[PDB]
Ligand binder design. Structure first.
Ligand SMILES: [Mg+2]
Ligand code: NI
Length: 346
């Protein structure tokens, strides 16, 4: 508009803005961006929503959301897994959820150039990434969760792939701030090595599409290895004309997973298939610009029966990447992100 993403024939800039406005309309007075009005909030989707608001130019609600991150961050640097209208429902810490604030903050700095925002959020990001690295296991993978009684010492490939990208975003912010973080550089290098070379470190979750594309989306796997991985499961997940399955054994396509795959395809230059998959998930779009979570494609039922802010948010981020509209559009492509210390693995 002309600053708002659009994809001709698929998504107008007006439609992109409308989806972002539906996210903003769900914001709680605290700044939380929940799944939907009356639903719960989780930190990862909260940040995802704030990134989409930034892309669409709704900077006021986006800043209120980042303020919520700052004001609710707990003493150890974490956020609870689940809150509902300010009532904590799951007080454990999910390492993936806590790290993602780094991505959202760096994305916001890329788009706005707002150094005062960077200075305000830098201690938030630093405390969060320090907390996440304190969950790293000896092999380099990250424990998926922490509770008051200790770490859950299983690692999830999707979460680790997301954290890998989040820490690289934290390192980009560290450079912007002029405050080197050698410990983060070591940690992210060891994490990337585990993702790439130690499959035995992660719980086996082969049926989930996110486990298939997240190593590519997060940048742990690129080039020939990434192209091979995408092609390896393509037909298990991609449903012609409809997007992609959340799990390989249910006739159920989901908008967010489709749009995350779009970002992964864009990252490896597969713009032909990125555009095809992006175009194929807009049957989930509702009249107010919000998106249904998913479709049971062999009977026509939406499932779950919910329109989720973060499905529209994922769509917006994919639209920005395809159109290369805002200065944050390439944050997953990651051309300029630091790599950390690639070596000395233990
Ligand atoms: Mg809280
Ligand atoms: Ni190794």
């Amino acid at each position: 508009l002309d600053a708002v993403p659009g994809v001709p024939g698929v998504l107008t800039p007006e439609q992109c803005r409308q989806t972002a406005q539906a996210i903003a309309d769900a914001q709680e007075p605290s700044g939380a961006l929940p799944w939907f009005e009356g639903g719960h909030t989780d930190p990862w989707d909260h940040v995802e929503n704030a990134m989409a608001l930034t892309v669409a130019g709704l900077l006021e609600p986006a800043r209120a959301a980042f303020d919520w991150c700052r004001t609710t961050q707990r003493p150890d640097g974490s956020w609870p897994i689940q809150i509902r209208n300010g009532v904590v429902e799951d007080a454990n810490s999910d390492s993936n959820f806590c790290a993602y604030v780094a991505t959202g903050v760096w994305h916001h700095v890329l788009i706005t150039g707002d150094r005062r925002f960077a200075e305000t959020m830098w201690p938030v990001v630093a405390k969060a990434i320090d907390f996440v690295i304190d969950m790293q296991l000896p092999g380099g993978e990250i424990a998926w969760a922490r509770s008051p009684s200790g770490l859950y010492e299983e690692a999830l490939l999707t979460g680790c792939a997301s954290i890998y990208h989040s820490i690289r975003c934290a390192l980009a912010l560290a450079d912007y701030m002029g405050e080197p973080q050698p410990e983060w550089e070591v940690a992210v290098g060891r994490l990337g090595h585990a993702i790439a070379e130690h499959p035995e470190a992660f719980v086996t979750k082969d049926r989930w599409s996110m486990e298939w594309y997240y190593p590519v989306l997060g940048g742990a796997l690129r080039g020939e290895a990434a192209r091979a991985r995408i092609n390896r499961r393509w037909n298990d997940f991609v449903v012609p004309g409809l997007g992609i399955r959340c799990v390989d054994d249910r006739p159920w396509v989901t908008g967010a997973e489709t749009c995350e795959l779009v970002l992964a395809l864009d990252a490896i230059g597969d713009l032909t298939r990125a555009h095809e998959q992006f175009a194929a998930m807009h049957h989930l779009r509702e009249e107010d610009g919000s998106y249904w979570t998913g479709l049971v494609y062999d009977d026509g039922k939406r499932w779950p029966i919910e329109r989720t802010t973060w499905t529209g948010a994922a769509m917006i981020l994919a639209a920005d990447a395809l159109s290369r509209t805002t200065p944050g559009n390439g944050i997953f492509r990651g051309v300029d992100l630091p790599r950390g210390l690639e070596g000395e693995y233990d």
